[PDB]
Amino acid sequence: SHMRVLVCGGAGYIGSHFVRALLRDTNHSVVIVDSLVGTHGKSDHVETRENVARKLQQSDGPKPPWADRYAALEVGDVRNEDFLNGVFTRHGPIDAVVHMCAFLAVGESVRDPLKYYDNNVVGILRLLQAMLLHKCDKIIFSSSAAIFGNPTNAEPIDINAKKSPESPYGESKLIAERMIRDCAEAYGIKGICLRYFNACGAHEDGDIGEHYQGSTHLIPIILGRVMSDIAPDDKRMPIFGTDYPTPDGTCVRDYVHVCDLASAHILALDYVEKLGPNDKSKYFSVFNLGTSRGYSVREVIEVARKTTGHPIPVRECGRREGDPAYLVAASDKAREVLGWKPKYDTLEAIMETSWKFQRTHPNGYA
Amino acid sequence: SHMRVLVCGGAGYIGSHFVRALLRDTNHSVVIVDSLVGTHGKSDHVETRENVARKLQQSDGPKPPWADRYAALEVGDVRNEDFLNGVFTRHGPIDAVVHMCAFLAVGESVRDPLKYYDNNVVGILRLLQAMLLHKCDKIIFSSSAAIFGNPTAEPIDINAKKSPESPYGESKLIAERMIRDCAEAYGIKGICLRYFNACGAHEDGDIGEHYQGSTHLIPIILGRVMSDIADKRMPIFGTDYPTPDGTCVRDYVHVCDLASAHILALDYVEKLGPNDKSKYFSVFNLGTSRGYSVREVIEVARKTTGHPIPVRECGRREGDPAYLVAASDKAREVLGWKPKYDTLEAIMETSWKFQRTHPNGYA
Ligand SMILES: NC(=O)c1ccc[n+]([C@@H]2O[C@H](COP(=O)([O-])OP(=O)(O)OC[C@H]3O[C@@H](n4cnc5c(N)ncnc54)[C@H](O)[C@@H]3O)[C@@H](O)[C@H]2O)c1
Ligand SMILES: NC(=O)c1ccc[n+]([C@@H]2O[C@H](COP(=O)([O-])OP(=O)(O)OC[C@H]3O[C@@H](n4cnc5c(N)ncnc54)[C@H](O)[C@@H]3O)[C@@H](O)[C@H]2O)c1
Numbered sequence: 001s002h003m004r005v006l007v008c009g010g011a012g013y014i015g016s017h018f019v020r021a022l023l024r025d026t027n028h029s030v031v032i033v034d035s036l037v038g039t040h041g042k043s044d045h046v047e048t049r050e051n052v053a054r055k056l057q058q059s060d061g062p063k064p065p066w067a068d069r070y071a072a073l074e075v076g077d078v079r080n081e082d083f084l085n086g087v088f089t090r091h092g093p094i095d096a097v098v099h100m101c102a103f104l105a106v107g108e109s110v111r112d113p114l115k116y117y118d119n120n121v122v123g124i125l126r127l128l129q130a131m132l133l134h135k136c137d138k139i140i141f142s143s144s145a146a147i148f149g150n151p152t153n154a155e156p157i158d159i160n161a162k163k164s165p166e167s168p169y170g171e172s173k174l175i176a177e178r179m180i181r182d183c184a185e186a187y188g189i190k191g192i193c194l195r196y197f198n199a200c201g202a203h204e205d206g207d208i209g210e211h212y213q214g215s216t217h218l219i220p221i222i223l224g225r226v227m228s229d230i231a232p233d234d235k236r237m238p239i240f241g242t243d244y245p246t247p248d249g250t251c252v253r254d255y256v257h258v259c260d261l262a263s264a265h266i267l268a269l270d271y272v273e274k275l276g277p278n279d280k281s282k283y284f285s286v287f288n289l290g291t292s293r294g295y296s297v298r299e300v301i302e303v304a305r306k307t308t309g310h311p312i313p314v315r316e317c318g319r320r321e322g323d324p325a326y327l328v329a330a331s332d333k334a335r336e337v338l339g340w341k342p343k344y345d346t347l348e349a350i351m352e353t354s355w356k357f358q359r360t361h362p363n364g365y366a
Numbered sequence: 367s368h369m370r371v372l373v374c375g376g377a378g379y380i381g382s383h384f385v386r387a388l389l390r391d392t393n394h395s396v397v398i399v400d401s402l403v404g405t406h407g408k409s410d411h412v413e414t415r416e417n418v419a420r421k422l423q424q425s426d427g428p429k430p431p432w433a434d435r436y437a438a439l440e441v442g443d444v445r446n447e448d449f450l451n452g453v454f455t456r457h458g459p460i461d462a463v464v465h466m467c468a469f470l471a472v473g474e475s476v477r478d479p480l481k482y483y484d485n486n487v488v489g490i491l492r493l494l495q496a497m498l499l500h501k502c503d504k505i506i507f508s509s510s511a512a513i514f515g516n517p518t519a520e521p522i523d524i525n526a527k528k529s530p531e532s533p534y535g536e537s538k539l540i541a542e543r544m545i546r547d548c549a550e551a552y553g554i555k556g557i558c559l560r561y562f563n564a565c566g567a568h569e570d571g572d573i574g575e576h577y578q579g580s581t582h583l584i585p586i587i588l589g590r591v592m593s594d595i596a597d598k599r600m601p602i603f604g605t606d607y608p609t610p611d612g613t614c615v616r617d618y619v620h621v622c623d624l625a626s627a628h629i630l631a632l633d634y635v636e637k638l639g640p641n642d643k644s645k646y647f648s649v650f651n652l653g654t655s656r657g658y659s660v661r662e663v664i665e666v667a668r669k670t671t672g673h674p675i676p677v678r679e680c681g682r683r684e685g686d687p688a689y690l691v692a693a694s695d696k697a698r699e700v701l702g703w704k705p706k707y708d709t710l711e712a713i714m715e716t717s718w719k720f721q722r723t724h725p726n727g728y729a
C-alpha cells in the first residue's frame with residue numbers, strides 16, 4: 001500500500017536501518033532529508049540509486065528482489081525552511097514524515113543545552129510547519145525513554161508513567177511530543193511518538209551499524225575497546241557510576257534491536273494511514289519500544305566478553321550527568337495496537353550482530 | 367542603582383508599565399526591543415527621548431525628578447538573528463534582559479499552537495543564545511499562571527504541580543526549563559515571574575490595554591460600555607466549571623504591582639555573583655491572592671461604570687483552567703514584594719479611568 005515517506009535524519013544509525021526496511025519490505029517511496037552532521041559529512045552507506053547500483057555491480061550472487069529499490073537523498077538541514085520547503089515540493093506530495101533527526105548525547109545536553117533545545121525543538125517545529133504548508137497529515141517521531149527519568153520499585157515503564165526528564169535531551173523529546181500532540185486537535189495531524197529505549201544491534205548483513213569512533217554509547221564503546229586489544233600491542237573499559245540504586249550499582253537499561261525498531265515504524269506508518277476523521281481521539285498516540293528484559297552496565301560487558309571472546313578489563317568512574325538509574329520498557333501497547341513482535345529477545349543475539357559489524361569495520365564506512 | 371536593561375516586549379501593555387517604573391523609581395538605563403506586533407505597529411505611547419520631551423512640553427508646573435529620563439527603542443523581532451546582535455552590539459554591555467515578548471491569547475493558542483510555539487519558544491531561545499554570545503548573564507522572564515493548569519480551592523504555590531491546559535501555558539513552561547537548564551550550564555541567573563491575571567492602568571491614566579481587539583475580560587467588558595456611549599451582549603465563557611458560581615475564578619493583579627516586582631527582581635539578580643550557587647534560578651508567583659469569578663468581575667465592572675452590562679452565557683473557551691489564584695508568600699518573603707493594590711474595585715477604577723478617556727486607543 002503505497003506512500004511517499006520523507007525520513008529526516010534518515011542517514012543515521014537507526015535511520016539507515018529504517019530505510020533498509022522500507023526499501024526491502026514496503027512499496028513505499030523514500031526521501032531522506034539528512035544534513036550528515038551525525039555521519040562525518042559522508043553518505044557512502046546511504047542506499048541511493050547511485051550507490052545501490054555500485055553495490056549490485058561489484059559482486060553478485062543471485063540478484064535479490066529488493067535490488068532496484070533506492071532512496072532519494074536531500075542533503076541539508078531541516079531547520080532551513082527554504083531548503084525543506086523545496087524538498088517537500090520537489091519530492092511530493094509527501095504522505096508521511098518520519099522524524100529521526102536530533103542531537104542525542106545525554107551527557108553533552110546537560111553541559112550545552114542551547115545546542116539541544118535549538119536542534120531538537122526548532123527542528124521539529126519546522127517539520128510540523130512544513131507539513132501544515134504542504135497538506136501533509138501523518139508523522140512518526142523518534143522519541144526516547146529519556147522522557148521518563150527517575151521515579152518521584154524499579155520495573156517496566158508503561159507509556160503513561162510520569163515524565164520528569166533528567167537531561168535537556170529528555171526535555172527536548174517531551175517538548176516535541178507536546179507540540180505534536182497539540183497539532184492533533186488543532187490541525188488534524190496524525191502523530192505517533194515512538195519512545196525507543198536503547199538502540200543496539202546491526203543489520204544481519206553486517207554492513208551498517210554504529211562504529212565506535214566518536215560514539216557516546218555503551219556497546220559501541222566496549223566493542224571499540226575490543227578493537228584495540230586486537231590492534232598491534234590507559235586501555236580499560238570505563239564504567240560511569242557504581243553507586244546507583246540498582247542490584248549492582250550500575251545503570252540498568254533495555255537494549256532493543258534496530259531492526260525490531262525498524263518494523264515498529266512500518267506498523268506505525270500503517271496504523272496512522274488507516275485513521276479516519278471518524279476517530280479522532282486516536283490521532284495522537286505513544287508507544288514504548290523495548291524488549292522488557294533489562295541488563296546492567298556490568299551485565300552488558302559480560303555478554304560482550306562471551307560474544308567476542310576477549311578479556312575486556314573494566315575501570316570504574318563517576319556517574320555521567322543526566323543518567324537515570326533504570327530504564328526498562330513495558331511494550332504491551334505496541335504489541336496490542338501495532339502488533340509489534342520484536343524478533344530479538346536476548347542481548348546475546350543482538351550483541352552478535354553488533355560485533356559482526358564492528359569487527360568487520362576497523363575504520364567504519366571509511 | 368545603574369544597570370543597563372534590555373526589555374523585550376517593552377512597547378506592550380505590561381512592558382510600558384514596567385518601563386515607566388524603571389524610569390521613575392531607579393537609575394537603570396533602558397533599551398527596548400519590540401516588533402510592535404502587539405501595538406498595532408505604532409509607538410506613540412512609548413517613553414522614548416522624543417515622547418518624554420513632549421509630555422514635558424504639554425505639561426504645566428515644576429518638573430518631576432524623572433522628567434528627563436527615557437528609554438531607547440529598537441524596532442524588530444527578537445527571532446531575527448542579525449537585528450538582535452545589532453541591538454546587543456550598539457547598546458552593550460547589557461547587564462540584564464527582561465523578556466516580556468510573546469503571543470498570549472489562551473484561546474488562540476489551542477486553535478493554532480505552532481504560532482505560539484514558534485514565537486514564545488523560538489523567542490526565548492534566541493535571547494538565551496544572544497545573552498550567551500554577548501556575555502550578558504542576568505534574565506527576568508515573563509511567565510504565567512497558565513503553567514499550572516488544573517490540579518490533580520487554594521491559592522497556588524510556586525511548586526504546585528504544573529500541567530498546562532493550553533499551548534500558551536506549555537510554551538511558558540518549556541522556557542522555564544530552558545532558563546533553569548541555562549543556569550546550570552552557563553551560570554546565567556534567571557528569575558521566572560509567574561504573573562497571574564494582569565489588570566489595571568497606571569494612575570496618570572495615559573496608558574493601558576485598549577479594548578479594540580483585546581482578548582481579555584476586563585478590557586472586553588469596558589469595551590461594551592464604550593461601544594454604547596462612545597449581540598452587543600457581554601459573553602460569559604462557560605458556566606459549568608467546578609467553581610462556587612460556575613464561572614472561572616482568576617486573580618487580578620495591578621500592572622504597577624507587577625512592575626515593581628521586576629525592579630525588586632533586578633536588585634535580586636545583581637546582588638549575586640561567583641560567590642553564590644543555587645540562588646541562580648528562582649521562580650515567583652505574582653497575584654493578590656484574592657480570586658474573582660467572571661460573574662463577580664462583571665459586578666465590579668457594573669459598579670464602576672454605572673452601566674448595566676447586559677450579559678449572555680456561552681460555552682467554554684478551550685484552554686481555560688477553572689481556578690487560578692496566587693499564593694505569594696515567597697514573592698513577599700524573598701524579594702520584599704508589597705502589592706499596593708488588593709481589591710478589584712480600586713484596580714478596576716484605574717482601568718476605567720484610562721479606558722473612558724481613550725475612545726479610540728492611541729489614535
Ligand atoms: N540511539 C539511540 O539509543 C536512540 C534511542 C532513543 C531515541 N533515539 C532518537 O532516534 C533518532 C536517531 O537516532 P540515531 O541513533 O540514528 O542517531 P544518529 O546521529 O545516527 O542519526 C540522526 C541523524 O539525524 C541527522 N541530523 C541531526 N540534526 C539534523 C538536522 N537538524 N537536519 C537534518 N539532519 C539532522 C544526523 O546527521 C543523523 O544522520 C534521534 O532522533 C534520537 O534522538 C535514538
Ligand atoms: N496580559 C496578561 O494577563 C499577562 C499575564 C501573565 C503573563 N503575561 C505575559 O507577560 C508578557 C506581557 O504581556 P502583555 O499583556 O503586555 O501583552 P502585549 O502583547 O501587550 O506585550 C507583548 C509585547 O511583545 C511584543 N512582541 C511579541 N512578539 C515579539 C517578537 N518576537 N519580537 C519582538 N517583540 C515581540 C508585542 O509587540 C508586544 O508589545 C507576555 O509575555 C505575556 O505572555 C501577561
Ligand SMILES: O=c1ccn([C@@H]2O[C@H](COP(=O)(O)OP(=O)(O)O[C@H]3O[C@H](CO)[C@H](F)[C@H](O)[C@H]3O)[C@@H](O)[C@H]2O)c(=O)[nH]1
Nearest residue numbers: 104106144145146196197216217218221238239240251320
Ligand atoms: O564508557 C561508558 C559509556 C557509557 N556508560 C553507561 O552505559 C549506560 C548506557 O549509556 P548510553 O549512552 O549507551 O545510552 P543511554 O542509557 O544514555 O541512553 C539514552 O540516550 C539514548 C540516545 O543517545 C536514547 F535516547 C535512550 O533512550 C536514553 O536512555 C549508562 O549507564 C551510561 O552511563 C558507561 O558506563 N561507560
Ligand SMILES: O=c1ccn([C@@H]2O[C@H](COP(=O)(O)OP(=O)(O)O[C@H]3O[C@H](CO)[C@H](F)[C@H](O)[C@H]3O)[C@@H](O)[C@H]2O)c(=O)[nH]1
Nearest residue numbers: 470472510511512561562581582583586601602603614683
Ligand atoms: O469575553 C470574555 C473574555 C474572557 N472571559 C473569561 O474571563 C476569564 C479570564 O480571561 P482572560 O483571557 O482575560 O484571562 P486568562 O485567565 O485567560 O489569562 C490567562 O492568559 C493571560 C495572558 O493572556 C495570563 F497569561 C494569565 O496568567 C492566564 O491565566 C476566563 O475564564 C475567560 O474565559 C469571558 O467569560 N468572556
